[PDB]
Scaffold this active site. Structure first.
Site, PDB file in Angstrom:
ATOM      1  N   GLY A 100       0.821  -1.203   0.000  1.00  0.00           N
ATOM      2  CA  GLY A 100       0.000   0.000   0.000  1.00  0.00           C
ATOM      3  C   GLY A 100       0.858   1.257   0.000  1.00  0.00           C
ATOM      4  O   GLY A 100       2.082   1.181  -0.123  1.00  0.00           O
ATOM      5  N   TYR A 151       3.157   3.786   1.059  1.00  0.00           N
ATOM      6  CA  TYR A 151       4.203   3.982   2.068  1.00  0.00           C
ATOM      7  C   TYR A 151       4.209   2.889   3.129  1.00  0.00           C
ATOM      8  O   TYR A 151       4.492   3.153   4.291  1.00  0.00           O
ATOM      9  CB  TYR A 151       4.035   5.317   2.794  1.00  0.00           C
ATOM     10  CG  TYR A 151       3.759   6.522   1.939  1.00  0.00           C
ATOM     11  CD1 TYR A 151       2.796   7.455   2.336  1.00  0.00           C
ATOM     12  CD2 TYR A 151       4.475   6.763   0.759  1.00  0.00           C
ATOM     13  CE1 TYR A 151       2.531   8.579   1.583  1.00  0.00           C
ATOM     14  CE2 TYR A 151       4.215   7.898  -0.006  1.00  0.00           C
ATOM     15  CZ  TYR A 151       3.240   8.806   0.423  1.00  0.00           C
ATOM     16  OH  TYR A 151       2.959   9.951  -0.287  1.00  0.00           O
ATOM     17  N   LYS A 194      -2.322  -1.586   7.809  1.00  0.00           N
ATOM     18  CA  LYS A 194      -1.158  -1.067   7.104  1.00  0.00           C
ATOM     19  C   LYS A 194      -0.091  -0.631   8.117  1.00  0.00           C
ATOM     20  O   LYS A 194      -0.332   0.259   8.932  1.00  0.00           O
ATOM     21  CB  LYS A 194      -1.566   0.138   6.238  1.00  0.00           C
ATOM     22  CG  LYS A 194      -0.400   0.929   5.640  1.00  0.00           C
ATOM     23  CD  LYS A 194      -0.745   1.559   4.298  1.00  0.00           C
ATOM     24  CE  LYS A 194      -0.929   3.051   4.394  1.00  0.00           C
ATOM     25  NZ  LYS A 194      -1.135   3.710   3.065  1.00  0.00           N
ATOM     26  N   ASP A 205      -6.201   6.181  -0.780  1.00  0.00           N
ATOM     27  CA  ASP A 205      -4.950   6.922  -1.103  1.00  0.00           C
ATOM     28  C   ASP A 205      -5.141   8.343  -1.640  1.00  0.00           C
ATOM     29  O   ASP A 205      -4.242   8.887  -2.284  1.00  0.00           O
ATOM     30  CB  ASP A 205      -4.058   6.156  -2.096  1.00  0.00           C
ATOM     31  CG  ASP A 205      -3.603   4.808  -1.571  1.00  0.00           C
ATOM     32  OD1 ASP A 205      -3.736   4.567  -0.351  1.00  0.00           O
ATOM     33  OD2 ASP A 205      -3.083   3.934  -2.304  1.00  0.00           O
TER      34      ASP A 205
HETATM   35  N1  LIG Z   1      -8.130  -1.141   3.162  1.00  0.00           N
HETATM   36  C1  LIG Z   1      -7.079  -1.286   2.319  1.00  0.00           C
HETATM   37  C2  LIG Z   1      -6.940  -2.160   1.256  1.00  0.00           C
HETATM   38  C3  LIG Z   1      -7.955  -3.122   0.876  1.00  0.00           C
HETATM   39  O1  LIG Z   1      -8.895  -3.364   1.633  1.00  0.00           O
HETATM   40  C4  LIG Z   1      -7.867  -3.853  -0.411  1.00  0.00           C
HETATM   41  C5  LIG Z   1      -7.472  -3.202  -1.594  1.00  0.00           C
HETATM   42  C6  LIG Z   1      -7.399  -3.927  -2.792  1.00  0.00           C
HETATM   43  C7  LIG Z   1      -7.727  -5.279  -2.805  1.00  0.00           C
HETATM   44  C8  LIG Z   1      -8.124  -5.924  -1.635  1.00  0.00           C
HETATM   45  O2  LIG Z   1      -8.411  -7.262  -1.751  1.00  0.00           O
HETATM   46  C9  LIG Z   1      -7.664  -8.102  -0.860  1.00  0.00           C
HETATM   47  C10 LIG Z   1      -8.582  -9.233  -0.391  1.00  0.00           C
HETATM   48  C11 LIG Z   1      -8.817 -10.291  -1.472  1.00  0.00           C
HETATM   49  N2  LIG Z   1      -8.158 -10.001  -2.756  1.00  0.00           N
HETATM   50  C12 LIG Z   1      -6.727  -9.709  -2.641  1.00  0.00           C
HETATM   51  C13 LIG Z   1      -6.424  -8.629  -1.602  1.00  0.00           C
HETATM   52  C14 LIG Z   1      -8.202  -5.218  -0.430  1.00  0.00           C
HETATM   53  C15 LIG Z   1      -5.665  -1.871   0.732  1.00  0.00           C
HETATM   54  N3  LIG Z   1      -5.038  -0.902   1.398  1.00  0.00           N
HETATM   55  N4  LIG Z   1      -5.917  -0.523   2.371  1.00  0.00           N
HETATM   56  C16 LIG Z   1      -5.566   0.456   3.328  1.00  0.00           C
HETATM   57  C17 LIG Z   1      -5.459   1.830   3.108  1.00  0.00           C
HETATM   58  C18 LIG Z   1      -5.100   2.662   4.167  1.00  0.00           C
HETATM   59  C19 LIG Z   1      -4.861   2.135   5.430  1.00  0.00           C
HETATM   60  F1  LIG Z   1      -4.510   2.950   6.433  1.00  0.00           F
HETATM   61  C20 LIG Z   1      -4.980   0.773   5.671  1.00  0.00           C
HETATM   62  C21 LIG Z   1      -5.329  -0.067   4.618  1.00  0.00           C
END
Ligand SMILES: Nc1c(C(=O)c2cccc(OC3CCNCC3)c2)cnn1-c1ccc(F)cc1
EC number: 2.7.11.24
Length: 338
Positions: A29, A31, A49, A164
Site C-alpha cells: 500500500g 508507504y 497497514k 490513497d
Molecule cells: N483497506 C485497504 C486495502 C484493501 O482493503 C484492499 C485493496 C485492494 C484489494 C483488496 O483485496 C484483498 C482481499 C482479497 N483479494 C486480494 C487482496 C483489499 C488496501 N489498502 N488498504 C488500506 C489503506 C489505508 C490504510 F490505512 C490501511 C489499509
C-alpha cells in the site's frame, strides 16, 4: 493499553494488539505494507497497514502525519476511513511505528474488470459512487491527485471505496494540466481521472496508454483536439505554450464515433469530463446530477464533509515535531461506533 504480540511476515516485524488475529499479507500500500486480519472485537475482517520508516526523515514524518490526519477526517460510505490506529510504543520517546486499521475490501477496480463482465448498469453504479466520494473529499478542499483503478476498491456487492486520496502507469489517468503544469489546476483534475476510468470500464481498454509525458499528451489531443485560442490564453508557461502550437493540429473527435455502442448518456458525460480546460470541466457535484445517474442520484444523500484544516501543509518543522504531532493524533483517536 491492550496486550500486544509479535511476528515476522516477509522480512518485516509486526507488533499488533491481541484483538487482531490471523495476519496475512495482501501486498503493498501507500508507504507501507498491508495485512488482512480478523478483528475479534467486532468479528470483522480488516486491513492493517504498517507504515514503513514513518519518522526516518522530514518527508516521511510529514507524510505519516498527513496520512493519519486525512484518514481520521474521512467519514463517508465511498471513502476509506479509520477503524483504529495504534503503536506498540508506551511513550513519545519510544514512538517509532504506526499501524492504521480500516475495512478490508474484496478487490480493486483493476481486478474486477478481467473477472466479471461489466454491464452499463455496473458502470453507472461504480462511477456514481466514485463521484459521490469525490464530492465529499472535494468539499473539504482535499484533492486526490492520483485517482486510478488500483486505488478504487470494491466488494462483491459492487460497493466502492476510494483509497490513497490527498497523498500525491499512474500517468495514464492524470489530467494534462498537472502532468505538464501548464495551466492552473483545481479539484477537477480528479474528474479527468474519473473520465479515463469510466472510458476503460466501458471499452475494456486503457483510453490513453502513453509511454511517457509527450506520447501521453499526444494520445490525449488525438481525442480532445489541440487547444484553440481561448485555451492557449490561459497557459502561463512559455515552454508549454510553444510545444502545443508547434505540434501538428488535431481536430476534436466525435465521442460517439469513438465510444461506439455505448449508452449515449454515458458518452455525453465523458464529453463533459474529458475537456482540457479545467474551468469548464464538470465538477463531481454537477456530474452526480447528470441524467446518466438517474437511477442512483439522490440529492438528499450525497453529503459533504466537515471543514478540514490543512494549514500544516505550509509548515516546515523538524522530524521530532512532526512525530510529536502524530503521537497526539494517535492518542486522541476516538473509534467509530459499531
Ligand atoms: N483497506 C485497504 C486495502 C484493501 O482493503 C484492499 C485493496 C485492494 C484489494 C483488496 O483485496 C484483498 C482481499 C482479497 N483479494 C486480494 C487482496 C483489499 C488496501 N489498502 N488498504 C488500506 C489503506 C489505508 C490504510 F490505512 C490501511 C489499509
Amino acid at each position: 493499553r491492550p496486550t500486544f504480540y509479535r511476528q515476522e511476515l516477509n522480512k518485516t516485524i509486526w507488533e499488533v494488539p491481541e484483538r487482531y488475529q490471523n495476519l496475512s499479507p495482501v501486498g503493498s500500500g501507500a508507504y507501507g505494507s498491508v495485512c488482512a486480519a480478523f478483528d475479534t472485537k467486532t468479528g470483522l475482517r480488516v486491513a492493517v497497514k504498517k507504515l514503513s520508516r514513518p519518522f526516518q526523515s522530514i518527508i516521511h514524518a510529514k507524510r505519516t502525519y498527513r496520512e493519519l490526519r486525512l484518514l481520521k477526517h474521512m467519514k463517508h460510505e465511498n471513502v476509506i476511513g479509520l477503524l483504529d490506529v495504534f503503536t506498540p510504543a508506551r511513550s513519545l520517546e519510544e514512538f517509532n511505528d504506526v499501524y492504521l486499521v480500516t475495512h478490508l475490501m474484496g478487490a480493486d477496480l483493476n481486478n474486477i474488470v478481467k473477472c466479471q463482465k461489466l454491464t452499463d448498469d455496473h458502470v453507472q453504479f461504480l462511477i456514481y459512487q466514485i463521484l459521490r466520494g469525490l464530492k465529499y473529499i472535494h468539499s473539504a478542499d482535499i484533492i486526490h491527485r492520483d485517482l486510478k483503478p488500483s486505488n478504487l476498491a470494491v466488494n462483491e456487492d459492487c460497493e466502492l471505496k476510494i483509497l490513497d486520496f490527498g497523498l500525491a502507469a499512474t500517468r495514464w489517468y492524470r489530467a494534462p494540466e498537472i502532468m505538464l503544469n501548464w495551466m492552473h489546476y483545481n479539484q477537477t483534475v480528479d474528474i479527468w481521472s474519473v473520465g479515463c476510468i469510466m472510458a476503460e470500464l466501458l471499452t475494456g481498454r486503457t483510453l490513453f496508454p502513453g509511454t511517457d509525458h509527450i506520447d501521453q499528451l499526444k494520445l490525449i489531443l488525438r481525442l480532445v483536439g489541440t487547444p484553440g485560442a481561448e485555451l492557449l490564453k490561459k497557459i502561463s508557461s512559455e515552454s508549454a505554450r510553444n510545444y502545443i502550437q508547434s505540434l501538428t493540429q488535431m481536430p476534436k473527435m466525435n465521442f460517439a464515433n469513438v465510444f461506439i455502442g455505448a449508452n449515449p448518456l454515458a458518452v455525453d458525460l465523458l464529453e463533459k469530463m474529458l475537456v482540457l480546460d479545467s474551468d469548464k470541466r464538470i465538477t463531481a457535484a454537477q456530474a452526480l446530477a447528470h441524467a446518466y445517474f438517474a437511477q442512483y442520484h439522490d440529492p438528499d444523500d450525497e453529503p459533504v464533509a466537515d471543514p478540514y484544516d490543512q494549514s500544516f501543509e505550509s509548515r516546515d518543522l523538524l522530524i521530532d515535531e512532526w512525530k510529536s504531532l502524530t503521537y497526539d493524533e494517535v492518542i486522541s483517536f476516538v473509534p467509530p461506533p459499531l
